Design a protein around this ligand. Structure first.
Ligand code: SF4
Ligand code: SF4
Ligand code: SF4
Ligand code: SF4
Ligand code: SF4
Ligand code: SF4
Ligand SMILES: [Cl-]
Ligand SMILES: [Cl-]
Ligand SMILES: [Cl-]
Ligand SMILES: [Cl-]
Ligand SMILES: [Cl-]
Ligand SMILES: [Cl-]
Ligand SMILES: [Cl-]
Ligand SMILES: [Cl-]
Ligand SMILES: [Cl-]
Ligand SMILES: [Cl-]
Ligand SMILES: [Cl-]
Ligand SMILES: [Cl-]
Ligand SMILES: [Zn+2]
Ligand SMILES: [Zn+2]
Lengths: 618, 621
């Protein structure tokens, strides 16, 4: 178990400090009379002391009152447990107490402390209350409830200092803030964090210029703010700030805490484009596929199952190719109710982009969920059920190249009973930092395989990560099954290339399809304006918010050298992965076919709609 | 018990008990060669003329019939062993989600008491079904719910070795309705109270009466054209509903839900009732306006099946405990030179001022008290204290509020007054709706024997009871606050200045060294006059009361229509509340022993942290 911001995973007269102190470790503590942290190297950044837990399962809870005055050594309660989690002002009390309660509940559930069984349910309710607070679904009554629960527990455990009572006493203001203002001042509660420009804004106006939809108003050097109603979460502003004034959260600490929670099942998915960029932080060239290094590293961190978003992309193609074929058949049949083009793209940014500016084209996009959310729902409603786990007993973490995927995973449509299909997102950069600080070097770690049932993927799925790949995959499947012919050359070079707005004409048998591809939302605006004006007609379109597609996402490591060359290199790495696959059509993936044969029975069925489709623009 | 009809009536061989959406529920003698349609016709058809939707056979177990069985000889073999031979007929006016929630909950109760042991194995599964249905009725679902239900259905059908599980057929036959509920958040029959909004329906003729009645000018439309409500500015004052010559404006009706909950075995149902109900309901049963028939209401509610009868006036006493404290605090801070403080303080249980202030008086958001309404204070206490004391989780108690207006429906629907999808007030029934339930169920308040209200949350003072008429809220708060600020007990506790009937009233109360200027408005136009005068500085007030209805709550839109002169009847009801007040030994809220017990045992004193956590809310978040 370990914990620190900027990351670490730390795997008599001895203690174990793993809080917000720089340099986590065990250290041999001297017996001389505030600077104890200093002996551990101070706290991350220079954040002031908040508290220090003694013993992870249970001990004492120390607050500021012990800071500049004699820290009685022996007050480490006899059940010291030889570990200390030190808190700074950067740690949210709600999140920490959730982690504490879950650790205690796990050790109860495994028999380690049966003397606490009598209070098991009570503590569980505490967690539930805490969870509701972190999810923003609470009133102030929760405090009342917590207090009584605290009072109850301390009665049966006979304690003179009950942690929850003191938490209420000392951090009432933070809790009230969370509940009434729906605000977590440390931004650890990912479900209370919005993309926001903070006080470090200098009014340089870079974000205003960079925003493709002009989401930011504000003049001179006056603080700028994001008009969340039109924000596409494309993340251009975050990359453009001369400072760190724009924050969209960082779930690193949540990931570490979950990994350190005993008997908690943590599974991961990873976006197609991550595997060709992450290795750059460890000496690989752009485009080199290091997915097996990622798998081994994630397992070393403690991940119990490593899957792949490209599997979900194959499932997405099953649905989207089916819908494209249906729309084409209706169009050719003279049904004027149908709408063309059909948009196929896993990028959330088009949603807000279309609703606010192309409200005559709400019937264009496919109803299929993204590969990330398709994977997530299948993992919790089928795989976990298969393994006899309820959805809350599985923590599904998505490693993605984008902040927009954080926003998507936070959407309430992709959740049930306050359990989010994607529990949270970790970006490529954040994972790089986790690996770096935990001593995991992807260059030197031994390869490991991704887990099969939701990890196998075709080249159609993998090319999702670069511009033109989604529509290429969907077209592969749809044209091949509409013609009955297997293509000798399955690659559609017309859909490749790098122009911001690309037009392609694909001929297969009697079928002729006109395709539009845009990467960069301004080029997308050009293409959609052309569609509306009738200057051009399209059967299908792909829209990507980032130049180059997902390989150019804002959550990816900053490129080294020539930017365009590096992005093209990553895209061609995805294309080379595709060329190296035996299976290059999504409908060939045996595991996705198993999904259809055993649960959903065929694409566009009622069950398939219920699980794998959603309603954009409700 | 069992029973149902939309005019609502809990009706406590070759004989069947028909209790669906058929006119004339009852026990009927089936002719030999008879279809289902013939049985329905012998019961007089369905309420209104709605077409047949379905028919449940046997309350726990039987079959589920659709249109396909209507013109087909009713074979009695569907009445298998000990089915009790009952049929619940559904019309197109019944929501399938609500009915299946009732069915599943009934089956779960019959399992839970051991009479149906062989189904215990599916208990959890059936429970999950209910949860799914509940989530659908509350609008917190995705389409995945259907998937889940299907598998649960299959699971049950596997574990019971049954050839036809009802839920599978439900999905098959009403997929469109279920999908509507989930994706469109729409219950086309409007039985799901958490999906109903106040809307003008298609039966609107464009007469424009509602537009004229609206105090905030919230309704648009001309000539025969359908009128529309700008829901963003609507105060839910309910004037439009009262003005409509037709039934074009609908705000839901939880009557059937109330009946189903009453018919569910071993389900704890408790009620609170607003002060103004008891002086108006009796008008429907031969009493004069202003006559207090609260004990008749208690007996009638118990006859319907209510397990505990409490009183909103108790919550009004608790409200005064909090609000008098806040008023005293603000006065003391004002006298000390606190420019931090804001006056007046608004004390009123009426929801309508909230949006009214938010939409037009945004410089006065710090004016209203942070205290909840009496209804919601009762609700939080009932579920978080009373139910807890009796070893019941909040979902094991169904708390029903009997109120005179649709604005209380809107308040009970607010998400702030809920936790984990449990609403503190499960739903509201109006005085009119309860009148119709009594009338159709054979409960006559004139001839029924009196019964007492339950004690712990039913005892109340005259200060609490006068809440139901204009000027009463501020009168009660003033009683308590002035008495405790002066240390003097008043010889005459009535403040005649706060009484009267003018739309905008000004009063000056003198007690010891204290001098308070009070403004009272009933009718939101009068409220606007008074708040404009406050804003211009033309008048100054220490505290104000705002009521949306003329005369206060006794004049609510959910009350029975008055007979004779409207104003005279409303004044009669208000004076009935005043006479109840005069008949009470305790006439200050701070004397109520049960409210004081709340403070002594749980919250420790008004305006404490615990009291804020439970009895206060944030209007204008
Ligand atoms: S870029 Fe960063 S700093 Fe420059 S204005 Fe936008 S936010 Fe403020
Ligand atoms: S994210 Fe993309 S859209 Fe939202 S503000 Fe920053 S730039 Fe404009
Ligand atoms: S393109 Fe790929 S990366 Fe850029 S935003 Fe859309 S999804 Fe995130
Ligand atoms: S009153 Fe009823 S009918 Fe006349 S306009 Fe308003 S709604 Fe339409
Ligand atoms: S309720 Fe009151 S406010 Fe809302 S519309 Fe009808 S009248 Fe206007
Ligand atoms: S006054 Fe009483 S009745 Fe009229 S609306 Fe406000 S609360 Fe409902
Ligand atoms: Cl683990
Ligand atoms: Cl995705
Ligand atoms: Cl493999
Ligand atoms: Cl980048
Ligand atoms: Cl199947
Ligand atoms: Cl069943
Ligand atoms: Cl009952
Ligand atoms: Cl009330
Ligand atoms: Cl009690
Ligand atoms: Cl309503
Ligand atoms: Cl009594
Ligand atoms: Cl009336
Ligand atoms: Zn937090
Ligand atoms: Zn419904």
């Amino acid at each position: 178990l370990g914990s620190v911001f900027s990351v670490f995973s730390e795997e008599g007269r001895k203690i174990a400090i793993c809080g917000k102190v720089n340099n986590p470790g065990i250290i041999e503590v001297p017996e001389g009379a505030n600077e104890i942290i200093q002996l551990c190297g101070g706290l991350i950044n220079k954040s002031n002391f908040k508290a220090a837990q003694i013993g992870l399962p249970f001990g004492g809870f120390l607050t500021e009152d012990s800071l500049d005055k004699e820290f009685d050594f022996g007050i480490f309660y006899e059940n010291i447990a030889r570990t200390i989690i030190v808190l700074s002002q950067e740690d949210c009390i709600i999140q920490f107490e959730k982690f504490y309660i879950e650790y205690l509940l796990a050790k109860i559930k495994d028999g380690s402390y049966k003397n606490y069984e009598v209070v098991k349910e009570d503590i569980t309710e505490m967690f539930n209350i805490l969870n509701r607070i972190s999810k923003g679904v609470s009133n102030m009554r929760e405090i009342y409830l917590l207090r009584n629960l605290a009072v109850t527990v301390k009665s049966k455990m006979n304690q003179k200092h009950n942690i929850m009572e003191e938490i209420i006493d000392k951090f009432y203001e933070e809790i009230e803030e969370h509940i009434e203002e729906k605000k977590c001042y440390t931004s650890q509660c990912n479900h209370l964090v919005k993309l926001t420009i903070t006080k470090k804004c200098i009014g340089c106006g870079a974000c205003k210029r960079a925003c493709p939809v002009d989401c930011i108003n504000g003049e001179l050097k006056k603080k700028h703010e994001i008009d969340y109603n039109r924000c596409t979460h494309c993340g251009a502003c975050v990359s453009a700030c001369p400072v760190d004034a724009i924050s969209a959260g960082d779930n690193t600490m949540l990931f570490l805490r979950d990994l350190a929670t005993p008997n908690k099942v943590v599974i991961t998915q990873m976006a197609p484009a991550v595997r060709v960029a992450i290795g750059e932080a460890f000496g690989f060239e752009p485009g080199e596929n290091v997915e097996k290094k990622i798998a081994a590293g994630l397992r070393k961190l403690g991940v119990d199952y490593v899957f792949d978003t490209s599997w979900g992309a194959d499932l997405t193609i099953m649905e989207e190719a089916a819908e494209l074929q249906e729309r084409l058949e209706r169009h050719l049949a003279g049904d004027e109710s149908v709408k063309l083009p059909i948009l196929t793209s896993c990028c959330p940014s088009w949603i807000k982009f279309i609703e606010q500016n192309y409200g005559d084209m709400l019937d264009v996009p496919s109803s299929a969920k993204s590969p990330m959310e398709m994977f997530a729902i299948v993992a919790k409603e089928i795989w976990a059920k298969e393994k006899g786990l309820s959805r809350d007993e599985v923590t599904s973490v998505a490693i993605m190249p984008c902040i927009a995927k954080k926003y998507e995973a936070s959407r309430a449509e992709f959740s049930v009973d306050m359990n989010y299909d994607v529990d949270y997102v970790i970006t490529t950069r954040e994972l790089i930092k986790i690996f770096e600080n935990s001593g995991i070097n992807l260059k030197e770690i031994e390869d490991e395989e991704i887990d099969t049932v939701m990890g196998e993927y075709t080249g159609a799925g993998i090319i999702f990560g670069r511009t033109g790949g989604v529509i290429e995959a969907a077209t592969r499947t749809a044209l091949e099954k509409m013609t009955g012919e297997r293509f000798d050359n399955i690659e559609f070079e017309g859909l490749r290339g790098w122009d911001g707005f690309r037009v392609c004409e694909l001929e297969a048998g009697d079928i002729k399809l006109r395709i539009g591809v845009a990467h960069g939302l301004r080029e997308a605006a050009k293409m959609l304006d052309k569609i509306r004006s009738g200057e051009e007609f399209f059967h299908a379109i792909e829209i990507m918010a980032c130049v180059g597609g997902c390989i150019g996402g804002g959550g990816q490591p900053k490129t080294k050298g020539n930017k365009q060359a590096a992005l093209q290199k990553r895209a061609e790495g995805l294309n080379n992965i595709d060329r190296s696959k035996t299976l290059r059509r999504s409908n060939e993936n045996p595991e996705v076919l198993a999904i259809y044969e055993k649960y959903l029975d065929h694409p566009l069925s009622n069950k398939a709609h219920e699980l794998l489709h959603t309603v954009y623009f409700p």
